[PDB]
Amino acid sequence: PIRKVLLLKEDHEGLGISITGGKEHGVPILISEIHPGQPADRCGGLHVGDAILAVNGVNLRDTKHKEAVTILSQQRGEIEFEVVYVA
């Protein structure tokens, strides 16, 4: 089940969540670590075990982990995040 959650990021604030994996290896990037006291916690949606699919309309499945880091950083102010609950 795909979940659409909109998170507001600021220039002074960071991502608030850590990702792991590697598309180049043959697997999509997912959320594993969460920083307590950041936009991620404020959203109440960024949970451990989230599979990334698209960010701000940009496809991540066809991009590499390193490339995704740069693209994610390009998102300013309002950032749209699309992930799927994995268990």
Side-chain angles (χ1 to χ4, degrees), residues 4-7 54-58 75 77-82:
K4 314 285 216 267
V5 188
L6 276 84
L7 224 174
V55 189
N56 212 306
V58 188
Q75 317 310 337
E78 187 182 284
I79 313 178
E80 272 136 78
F81 230 87
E82 289 98 86

Side-chain angles (χ1 to χ4, degrees), residues 3 24 33 42 46 67:
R3 240 288 195 283
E24 200 161 287
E33 219 94 290
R42 278 162 132 286
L46 234 299
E67 201 81 281

Side-chain angles (χ1 to χ4, degrees), residues 1-82:
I2 185 141
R3 240 288 195 283
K4 314 285 216 267
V5 188
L6 276 84
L7 224 174
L8 232 89
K9 228 247 257 91
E10 263 269 43
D11 287 46
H12 58 89
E13 289 241 78
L15 238 179
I17 52 99
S18 317
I19 50 170
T20 182
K23 208 274 138 188
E24 200 161 287
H25 301 244
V27 285
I29 312 304
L30 311 93
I31 315 296
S32 201
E33 219 94 290
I34 311 174
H35 283 264
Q38 248 115 100
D41 273 44
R42 278 162 132 286
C43 206
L46 234 299
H47 61 66
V48 187
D50 245 327
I52 311 162
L53 274 180
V55 189
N56 212 306
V58 188
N59 232 99
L60 216 146
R61 269 202 166 167
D62 285 82
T63 67
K64 273 72 79 261
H65 182 261
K66 310 211 195 301
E67 201 81 281
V69 185
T70 323
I71 306 151
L72 252 92
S73 296
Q74 294 291 330
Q75 317 310 337
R76 291 137 156 194
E78 187 182 284
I79 313 178
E80 272 136 78
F81 230 87
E82 289 98 86

